[PDB]
C-alpha cells in the first residue's frame, strides 16, 4: 500500500518524464515544474528527494 508521499513522488516522476521527453510545450513544462514544487510542498518532502 503506497504512502501519500510515495503517491506524490510517483506523480512527480511521471510529470518529470513528460517534460524530459518534451511531450507538451515549453510553456506546459513551465507549468508542470511549478506543479511539482507545489506537490512536494503539500505532501511534506523536497522535490529533489523524490
Amino acid at each position: 500500500s503506497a504512502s501519500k508521499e510515495e503517491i506524490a513522488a510517483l506523480i512527480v516522476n511521471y510529470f518529470s518524464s513528460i517534460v524530459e521527453k518534451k511531450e507538451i510545450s515549453e510553456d506546459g513544462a513551465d507549468s508542470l515544474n511549478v506543479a511539482m514544487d507545489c506537490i512536494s510542498e503539500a505532501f511534506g518532502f523536497e522535490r529533489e528527494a523524490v
Binding site: 510553456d27 513551465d30 507549468s31 511549478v34 506543479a35 514544487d37 507545489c38 510542498e41
Partner: protein, 79 residues
C-alpha cells in the same frame, strides 16, 4: 487605469501583498516590485503565474486580462 493586483506566495513562509500597476506595465515590472519589497534579490528568482499559466517577463499586464481589483498573481520564489 490602474490594476490593483494581489501578489500571493504560498511556499512557506507565505505572504500576500498588494500594489497598483498600469495595464501597460510588464510582468518584469511586477518582479521588480517584489525585489523593491525585498521578497527576492534578483528577477531570476521569481516565477509568476495566473491560475496555471507561468507568465513570461515580456508580457504586458493588459495581456493577462485580469479584473481591475479582484485578481491574484501566484508567486514562486527560489532563492
Amino acid at each position: 487605469a490602474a490594476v490593483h493586483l494581489t501578489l500571493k506566495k504560498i511556499q512557506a513562509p507565505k505572504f500576500s501583498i498588494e500594489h497598483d500597476f498600469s495595464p501597460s506595465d510588464t510582468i518584469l515590472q511586477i518582479k521588480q516590485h517584489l525585489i523593491s519589497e525585498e521578497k527576492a534579490s534578483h528577477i531570476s528568482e521569481i516565477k509568476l503565474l495566473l491560475k496555471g499559466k507561468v507568465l513570461h517577463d515580456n508580457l504586458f499586464l493588459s495581456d493577462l486580462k485580469v479584473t481591475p481589483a479582484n485578481s491574484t498573481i501566484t508567486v514562486m520564489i527560489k532563492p
